[PDB]
Amino acid sequence: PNYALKFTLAGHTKAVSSVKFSPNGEWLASSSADKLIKIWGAYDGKFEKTISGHKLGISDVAWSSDSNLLVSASDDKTLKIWDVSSGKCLKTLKGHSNYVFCCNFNPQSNLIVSGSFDESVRIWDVKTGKCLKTLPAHSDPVSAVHFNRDGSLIVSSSYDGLCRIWDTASGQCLKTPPVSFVKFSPNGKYILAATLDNTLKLWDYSKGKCLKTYTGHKNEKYCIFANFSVTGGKWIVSGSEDNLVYIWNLQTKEIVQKLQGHTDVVISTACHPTENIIASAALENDKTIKLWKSDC
Numbered sequence: 001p002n003y004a005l006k007f008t009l010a011g012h013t014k015a016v017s018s019v020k021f022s023p024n025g026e027w028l029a030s031s032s033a034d035k036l037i038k039i040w041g042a043y044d045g046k047f048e049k050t051i052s053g054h055k056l057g058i059s060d061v062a063w064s065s066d067s068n069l070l071v072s073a074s075d076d077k078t079l080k081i082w083d084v085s086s087g088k089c090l091k092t093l094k095g096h097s098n099y100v101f102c103c104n105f106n107p108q109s110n111l112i113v114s115g116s117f118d119e120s121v122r123i124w125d126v127k128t129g130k131c132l133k134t135l136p137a138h139s140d141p142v143s144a145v146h147f148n149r150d151g152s153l154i155v156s157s158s159y160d161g162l163c164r165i166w167d168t169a170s171g172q173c174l175k176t177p178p179v180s181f182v183k184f185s186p187n188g189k190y191i192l193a194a195t196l197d198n199t200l201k202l203w204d205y206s207k208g209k210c211l212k213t214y215t216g217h218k219n220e221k222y223c224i225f226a227n228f229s230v231t232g233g234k235w236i237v238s239g240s241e242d243n244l245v246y247i248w249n250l251q252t253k254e255i256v257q258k259l260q261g262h263t264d265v266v267i268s269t270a271c272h273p274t275e276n277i278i279a280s281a282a283l284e285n286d287k288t289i290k291l292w293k294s295d296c
């Protein structure tokens, strides 16, 4: 690929924590330690609006399938569901007893999954705003939660060193250094897992076997988002503690590009759902989001 910097998105006043593209490709959402969500045009980086209400910093944000809703996870121990077009808080999800660190809608978007420093994973009904299930998932803070393609499985990761797969309907576990990030692949067959020993691994969760290992980035302290890029060449994309965006060939595991420009840890990256566009976001020496575009 030839990702090149097209726009820098300034406005957050503390570290950015997460960036996500809306499923319809129109919007980028960012969350920050400054307690704010900001919405940006996905193709031109144009600032659209600020969404406020959380009492403390926000760690994560995630879109509903129809791109109409956002859920945010906050240090104020709540999640908030937002109407993106109005900016209004629709529901506040209360139940966690410590910082909420990660969140996601299921593909149907009738459920939200959250992970918290309270070491639990919670499953929430979007329509009633009530907690359906509290999973005693881990023995250290939960670093990531992700639904598979039909919402039947949740993958979770933790500083306890474990990655677990949960049956959504029952909340029961199906399968078991800190594991700092996990997510299902777009076909739902693989799980990409980061560990705080500077290593990403692609797992066949059916076989429970590691198929690929990606290194060259720096990751020993922070939970850094990673992604499958599928709109063009099949890459793995991650931030890094050396302030760069790393792109690997998924099959050969070779580094194909390093994106330079940020001035602090690249804590989050995201991949546009239909175009060859990457968003990246950095910690508080930088506080900006960058939009990069590739011809393939």
Ligand SMILES: COc1cc(Cn2nnc3c2CCc2c(-c4ccc(F)cc4C)cc(Cn4ccn(C)c4=N)cc2-3)cc(OC)c1
Pocket: 015, 016, 017, 018, 032, 033, 034, 056, 057, 058, 059, 060, 075, 101, 102, 103, 141, 142, 143, 144, 145, 159, 180, 181, 221, 222, 223, 224, 225, 267, 268, 283
């Ligand atoms: C996760 O549990 C932990 C974490 C840590 C330390 N730490 N490491 N990385 C991150 C952190 C904390 C801060 C952090 C944040 C964050 C959160 C709130 C906020 F206002 C602003 C920021 C930048 C965000 C991510 C990225 N991000 C957000 C959601 N997801 C899924 C992720 N990848 C990462 C971090 C220490 C620990 O015990 C020693 C246990």
